[PDB]
A paper describes a structure:
While there is full density for [name] ligand in all six monomers, KSF is present in only three out of the six active sites. Interestingly, in the ligand unbound sites we instead observed density for tartrate, which is a component of the crystallization medium. Unlike in the [name] [name]:[name] structure, Loop 2 (residues 154–165) and Loop 3 (residues 248–268) are disordered and Mg2 is absent from the active site of the [name]:KSF complex. The three monomers containing KSF all adopt the same conformation with an average RMSD of 0.29, however in chain E, the pyrrolidine is flipped ~135° compared to chains D and F where KSF adopts a similar orientation to [name]. Similar to [name], the bidentate hydroxamate of KSF completes the octahedral coordination of Mg1 while hydrogen bonding with the charged side chains of Gln166, Asp316, and Lys392. The phosphonate group of KSF is also within hydrogen bonding distance of Arg370, Ser371, Ser41, and Lys341. Importantly, the change in hybridization of C5 from sp3 tetrahedral geometry in [name] to sp2 trigonal planar geometry in KSF more accurately reflects the geometry of the PEP product rather than the anionic intermediate. The downstream effect of this observation manifests in a very significant reorientation of the phosphate group which no longer interacts with His158 and completely destabilizes Loops 2 and 3. This major conformational change is reflected in over 400-fold loss in activity between [name] and KSF ([name] IC50: 18.4 ± 2.84 nM, KSF IC50: 7.67 ± 0.38 µM).
Residue numbers in the entry:
A (entry chain A): -7 to 430
B (entry chain B): -7 to 157, 160 to 430
Write the structure that this text describes.
């Protein structure tokens, strides 16, 4: 006899704007407004170095503004054609909404409107619909994902020694990360993260090394070899009074694409030597004998599929192997990968494919093949904490959202603490068993 | 004949919790819940070096947790005594709420519950009332401040070369001010552009482009002076004119290098200066570069020195009390009376309530002093100082370099606000700064 406000979930207004990411560069923010007075706001993150096959991040190319990195073109697409195509449609139909933007854009890689325009509206629509449905975003995502009320708190891998391209050289491997698998809650995990992060500062100070931080809030000191990065991390874990292996395991992103030239992998650090896919695989293998490294990401170039097949036969039984640039959150590429025994895990970045629907497809493909899904940030982040809710709503089991420094990283850790506060053991922290090969 | 929910603004629940700041240290978050189903949520920031007279930040000191930096005690204060005293009180009465907590704590420096506990509730209370009143926070603050509908977009001073507490740079912060911009959106773009050109400049010279707490560069430079030289090189490379388009600001945090009544610059020969000598050094720099604002140019306890610096430089230069005043009307009042400084840096966690913070902005404006709404080194995703800066038409903000979302979420909030208000919230540029 009386209709609730919740039932008036038709899109009435969509606003795009240009905001600033954690590196000082424009990205796109979108608002979605429902008839019933429900609003959702979201932002696109930005990769520092993107995979070849990522959906297109549309930039202006206008030198007089933000050194060419403005996104007004992408925002215009939000405020006009996308807005006009979504007014009148039901926010609660995520897949319906994503399809209308995919079909209206019409290109394979979202090159007309920008993956950055379409994702911002996709995520903002999702938040609006959650509000209209009277639930928090993690709860709405679980329903959109076809796994209602099924939650976990993800085991984080925290990038605390930056390297390679987007640090300051000496170190070739892009990210060394700690995973607090020994924690019984994500709050405890986050504390253990903070402590080892602070103890590492003391260690680097002791050696006269720089304790300023890179894009992901980790340290970029000048180190003799890729190895020594692990060394200093081991010192910090002991100095915090945690036990390497039991309380904290290690993970890496090689971003091996960045140091691949003429079918060979070239390390500035460790001598200056060139390695074959096989030789590089054996180098990584050695590190996993000296240290408890249980996850290695982009261990080879995105286009070295023979390489990845070899690395997967050799290491894949003992070690989680994570596709990032390899799979770019794309079900077409992940499907080819599963079928060729390539990796056993995927890094989930919604802006590599550019819609939440196509993102949840990727997690489902992964989990149904017995691959793990790690919900991931980009080097270029915002105060947006969407990946926190996504990790919880999909029971992904793992998250990569940075060091324990910079609010571009820590907003996600804060959101995970808020969410665990609501859910308690309705979202268990499952620890080491989340990681592929444990 | 029907009562709207806006009118049911009695506090029914307050929740405290331990979240993490931009340095990885715990801080207090508070939620305030009104009967009419309105919520506000806010966090306390934390300073890296505090002034000696700041309202106490309550830490647990429990060495087995966050290296003794837990805030479970302050959170307990929020969930127990503060919640219990505030239940059933009207959130819309910001002054009444802040009064109940200051009285219940009963100490001078909020040393019972902690300034982090009282501030988080103070700010969450404000936001919840704003919701009850059906208005954005800047609009509510303008009404709490006795200045209805009176807005400006603040001229930002952006810390892009860090120093003092890891190089030969004694001066804590070198800042650019895009005074030549027509809007805060343009000002933010100009700061992005200069910040990115500076990176190229530091790479070309082989210096480190990793960032400190406030998202600025921390390279090892020869002298304090070269900090300014590289900033000029970046401004020229970004196609902007030093003086006209971009002015410069410093924070000496001179308290940090003050020992046996002398000012000792470890780098510049490790030489020792008297208040007067150090004032003349700062004077020299304002002849070589368009430095228009100097903060804590002397120790927080050298009131003699500040009286001299204010005589010499006050007419031409904005002189900003940070550790000198700690956003505290008792101290600022003694400062105004003795012709000490002409500008105050406003940190709501230095005094620990919104009401006391609004009092400090009013004391200053009435005295012809400028107010600069500031962050702390420890920040969160919280963007309150944006709304505070617009609501009080303060005219200036220090909320960081154009890097790290702990900073950029403030610029982002300013961009959102300016989109709504347009020319109702003018960017007045250089005329905001004391001595222009
Ligand atoms: Mg990667
Ligand atoms: Mg200061």
């Amino acid at each position: 006899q009386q209709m609730g406000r919740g039932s008036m979930s038709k899109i009435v207004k969509i606003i795009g704007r240009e905001i600033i990411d954690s590196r000082g560069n424009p990205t796109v923010e979108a608002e979605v407004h429902l008839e019933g007075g429900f609003v959702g706001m979201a932002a696109a993150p930005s990769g520092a170095s993107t995979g070849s096959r990522e959906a297109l991040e549309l930039r202006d190319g206008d030198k007089s503004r933000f050194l060419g990195k403005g996104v007004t073109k992408a925002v215009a697409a939000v405020n006009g054609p996308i807005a006009q195509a979504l007014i009148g449609k039901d926010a609660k139909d995520q897949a319906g909404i994503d399809k209308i933007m995919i079909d209206l854009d019409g290109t394979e890689n979202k090159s007309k409107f920008g993956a950055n325009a379409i994702l911002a509206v996709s995520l903002a629509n999702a938040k609006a619909a959650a509000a209209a449905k009277g639930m928090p975003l993690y709860e709405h995502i679980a329903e959109l994902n076809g796994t209602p009320g099924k939650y976990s708190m993800p085991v984080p891998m925290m990038n605390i020694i930056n390297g390679g391209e987007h640090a300051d050289n000496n170190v070739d491997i892009q990210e060394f990360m700690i995973q607090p698998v020994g924690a019984k809650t994500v709050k405890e995990a986050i504390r253990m993260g903070s402590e080892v992060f602070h103890h590492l500062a003391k260690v680097l100070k002791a050696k006269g090394m720089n304790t300023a931080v890179g894009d992901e809030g980790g340290y970029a000191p000048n180190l003799g070899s890729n190895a020594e990065a692990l060394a200093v991390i081991a010192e910090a874990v002991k100095a915090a009074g945690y036990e390497l292996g039991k309380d904290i395991t290690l993970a890496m992103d090689c971003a091996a694409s960045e140091f691949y030239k003429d079918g060979k992998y070239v390390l500035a650090g460790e001598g200056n030597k060139a390695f074959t896919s096989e030789e590089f695989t054996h180098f990584l293998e050695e590190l996993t004998k000296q240290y408890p490294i249980v996850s290695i990401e982009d261990g080879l170039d995105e286009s070295d599929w023979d390489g990845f097949a070899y690395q997967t036969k050799v290491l894949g039984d003992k070690i989680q192997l994570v596709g990032d640039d390899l799979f770019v959150t794309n079900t077409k590429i992940l499907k080819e990968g599963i079928e060729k025994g390539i990796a056993n895990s995927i890094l989930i970045k919604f802006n590599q494919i550019g819609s939440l629907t196509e993102t949840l497809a990727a997690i489902k493909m992964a989990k149904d093949a017995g691959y793990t899904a790690v919900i991931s940030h980009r080097s270029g982040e915002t105060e947006d904490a969407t990946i926190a809710d996504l990790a919880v709503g999909t029971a992904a089991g793992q998250i990569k959202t940075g060091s324990m420094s910079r609010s571009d990283r820590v907003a996600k850790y804060n959101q995970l603490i808020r969410i665990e506060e609501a859910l308690g053991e309705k979202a268990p922290y499952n620890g080491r068993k989340e990681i592929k090969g444990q």
